[PDB]
Amino acid sequence: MGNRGMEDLIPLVNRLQDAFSAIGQNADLDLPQIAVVGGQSAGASSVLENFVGRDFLPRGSGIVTRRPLVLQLVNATTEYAEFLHCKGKKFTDFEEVRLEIEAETDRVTGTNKGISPVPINLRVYSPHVLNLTLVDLPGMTKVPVGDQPPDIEFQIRDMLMQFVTKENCLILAVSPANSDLANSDALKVAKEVDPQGQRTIGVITKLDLMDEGTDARDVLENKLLPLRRGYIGVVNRSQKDIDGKKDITAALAAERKFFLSHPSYRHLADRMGTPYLQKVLNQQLTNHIRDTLPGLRNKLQSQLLSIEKEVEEYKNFRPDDPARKTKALLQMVQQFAVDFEKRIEGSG
Amino acid sequence: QPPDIEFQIRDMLMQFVTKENCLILAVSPANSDLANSDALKVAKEVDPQGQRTIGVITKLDLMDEGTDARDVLENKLLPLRRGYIGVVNRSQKDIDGKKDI
Ligand SMILES: Nc1nc2c(ncn2[C@@H]2O[C@H](COP(=O)(O)OP(=O)(O)O)[C@@H](O)[C@H]2O)c(=O)[nH]1
Ligand SMILES: Nc1nc2c(ncn2[C@@H]2O[C@H](COP(=O)(O)OP(=O)(O)O)[C@@H](O)[C@H]2O)c(=O)[nH]1
Ligand SMILES: [Mg+2]
Numbered sequence: 001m002g003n004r005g006m007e008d009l010i011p012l013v014n015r016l017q018d019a020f021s022a023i024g025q026n027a028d029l030d031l032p033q034i035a036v037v038g039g040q041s042a043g044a045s046s047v048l049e050n051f052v053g054r055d056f057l058p059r060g061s062g063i064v065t066r067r068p069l070v071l072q073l074v075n076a077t078t079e080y081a082e083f084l085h086c087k088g089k090k091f092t093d094f095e096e097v098r099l100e101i102e103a104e105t106d107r108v109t110g111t112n113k114g115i116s117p118v119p120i121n122l123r124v125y126s127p128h129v130l131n132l133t134l135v136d137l138p139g140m141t142k143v144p145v146g147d148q149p150p151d152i153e154f155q156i157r158d159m160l161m162q163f164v165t166k167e168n169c170l171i172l173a174v175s176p177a178n179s180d181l182a183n184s185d186a187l188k189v190a191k192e193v194d195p196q197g198q199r200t201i202g203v204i205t206k207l208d209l210m211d212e213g214t215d216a217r218d219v220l221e222n223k224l225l226p227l228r229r230g231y232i233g234v235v236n237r238s239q240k241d242i243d244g245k246k247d248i249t250a251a252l253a254a255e256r257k258f259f260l261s262h263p264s265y266r267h268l269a270d271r272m273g274t275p276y277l278q279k280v281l282n283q284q285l286t287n288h289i290r291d292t293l294p295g296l297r298n299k300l301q302s303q304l305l306s307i308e309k310e311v312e313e314y315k316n317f318r319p320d321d322p323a324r325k326t327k328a329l330l331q332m333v334q335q336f337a338v339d340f341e342k343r344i345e346g347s348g
Numbered sequence: 349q350p351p352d353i354e355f356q357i358r359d360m361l362m363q364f365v366t367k368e369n370c371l372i373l374a375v376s377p378a379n380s381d382l383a384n385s386d387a388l389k390v391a392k393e394v395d396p397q398g399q400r401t402i403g404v405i406t407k408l409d410l411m412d413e414g415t416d417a418r419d420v421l422e423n424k425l426l427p428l429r430r431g432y433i434g435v436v437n438r439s440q441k442d443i444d445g446k447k448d449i
Binding site: 145 | 379382383384386388410412413414415425426441
């Protein structure tokens with residue numbers, strides 16, 4: 001478990017914040033939010049929790065993500081979690097967090113596969129995290145089931161648009177490997193909000209459920225459908241694994257063996273896996289934080305220039321200074337005589 | 349393929365399933381959530397009452413270990429008037445292996 005690529009980026013945020021906080025101003029470290037987009041049963045929830053590094057989300061077959069979950073990571077001296085609707089309560093075990101998520105979902109949506117556009121806000125504190133916003137959205141569908149109205153498609157789409165048309169947001173498009181990539185819904189959305197692929201990152205899931213004799217080699221090599229940032233293959237847990245409480249360590253080891261042994265993927269074994277997706281995202285934050293430094297320097301540079309002309313004199317102040325008093329006297333008298341002539345004569 | 353490939357293919361479907369004296373076979377794999385099928389959405393829009401539509405489930409040997417399609421084959425998840433029929437075809441390895449029908 002855990003995400004150790006944050007450690008190299010936490011102090012940079014602290015140092016810059018301490019730099020501005022001393023002057024009574026805050027640092028515009030507007031780190032982007034990460035939205036996970038995909039279709040029903042694509043694997044989005046499994047992907048997202050691997051970036052957080054904690055096992056707390058609900059996952060499995062069926063419509064499990066019935067409400068948008070917004071996770072806010074906050075740097076803190078101790079690790080704990082809390083909800084907005086459980087004010088005054090403290091969560092010290094993520095299993096309780098997962099159960100609360102299901103309970104809060106059913107209380108509003110019912111049990112017959114309902115949805116609700118009102119999100120759930122989870123705030124996890126920890127010393128090993130940045131101040132990040134992570135969004136876990138419901139998957140998209142075509143036809144209603146259970147109590148879903150005829151317009152279930154568009155209600156889900158609007159929930160999606162509110163979080164992906166927002167600037168400064170990484171779109172993490174997850175698609176299954178055992179379905180034709182031309183018929184993925186994630187990529188249809190990405191190419192409508194991010195035409196040039198500057199934000200979009202593709203993930204290919206379910207590489208271990210391919211039909212025998214077929215592979216995704218022309219996908220992971222960015223040949224079938226060119227994507228600016230390429231595709232990353234991942235092998236998450238199976239539904240049996242979820243119900244079997246399979247450990248994370250075993251899942252990662254199996255993912256490593258898979259890519260190292262599959263004949264069509266060995267030459268890409270180092271571009272794929274859970275840890276590589278962490279590295280790409282972390283590197284994506286680091287590029288953003290370092291791309292904003294020029295603005296911060298210019299702000300401080302402008303302020304010094306404005307203040308410098310006066311503090312040059314204040315720093316040399318001595319109360320016993322006849323020269324200052326007489327210089328002040330000549331300035332006041334010259335100001336009065338100019339103001340006086342202005343009002344009477346019209347000069348100036 | 350131009351940007352409007354989606355609506356060019358759809359306009360071809362709407363020339364054969366938008367008329368009477370026609371049966372429609374809604375084909376969809378079983379290794380994906382049935383709620384996301386494009387076959388049913390088209391059939392439901394053209395044949396709301398399910399008079400003509402018949403559902404087919406094509407890939408039952410490719411389902412993730414630990415689940416099954418009973419909720420569909422028993423016409424419970426998305427009840428369809430004429431039910432659903434499950435089939436198991438030749439894999440890609442078999443097509444290239446010259447396996448007899
Ligand atoms: N074996 C395997 N199972 C997967 C993979 N990706 C997703 N699944 C399964 O697909 C189901 C759906 O997972 P989930 O992410 O909750 O779908 P979601 O509704 O999009 O969140 C789960 O049972 C996962 O175990 C994969 O790469 N390999
Ligand atoms: N293993 C397996 N493969 C299947 C099954 N049904 C279809 N396929 C595969 O589906 C692939 C494409 O089928 P096809 O009918 O051409 O899809 P189409 O583009 O709609 O015609 C073929 O390679 C088949 O081997 C199945 O039940 N099991
Ligand atoms: Mg989900």
